[PDB]
Design a protein around this ligand. Structure first.
Ligand SMILES: [Zn+2]
Ligand SMILES: [Zn+2]
Ligand SMILES: [Zn+2]
Lengths: 93, 55
């Protein structure tokens, strides 16, 4: 396809939210079954993360944010791009 | 990626402000966020371990 700069901004925002939510949830799983963070959409992406761990629909999945989140996460893991317009804020900051 | 950095990015990017979160599509993600061809779309609990500061 053709890269849209705006999609790449929504993608990196969803990535930051996924990374926050994971860390948030890790800080919760040690501090009790808290689920107290009120950041917008934080609860949402925590439930998305737990969905896709035990999910098996894969790309067939229409649960909001599952397919996309799984793709964005997989990218960020392997993205070694110097220049990447998605990851550069997170990798280098 | 310190959680301190991630909170700073969350606030610099507007995510602390109430919003609609768009439901991106797998297609728009495969385009604008390509996997290597590794073709390794992480699943199971490994998919969470990735997020633990993986390079
Ligand atoms: Zn949170
Ligand atoms: Zn799913
Ligand atoms: Zn990247």
């Amino acid at each position: 396809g053709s890269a849209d700069p705006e999609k790449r901004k929504l993608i990196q925002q969803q990535l930051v939210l996924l990374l926050h939510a994971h860390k948030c949830q890790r800080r919760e799983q040690a501090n009790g079954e808290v689920r107290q963070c009120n950041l917008p959409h934080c609860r949402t992406m925590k439930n998305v993360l737990n969905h896709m761990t035990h999910c098996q629909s894969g790309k067939s999945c229409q649960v909001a944010h599952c397919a996309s989140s799984r793709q964005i996460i997989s990218h960020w893991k392997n993205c070694t791009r110097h220049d990447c317009p998605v990851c550069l804020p997170l990798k280098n900051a | 990626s310190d959680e301190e950095v991630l909170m700073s990015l969350v606030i610099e990017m507007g995510l602390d402000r109430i919003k609609e979160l768009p439901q991106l599509t797998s297609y728009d993600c495969e385009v604008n966020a390509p996997i290597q061809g590794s073709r390794n779309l992480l699943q199971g609990e490994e998919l969470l371990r990735a997020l633990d500061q993986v390079n």
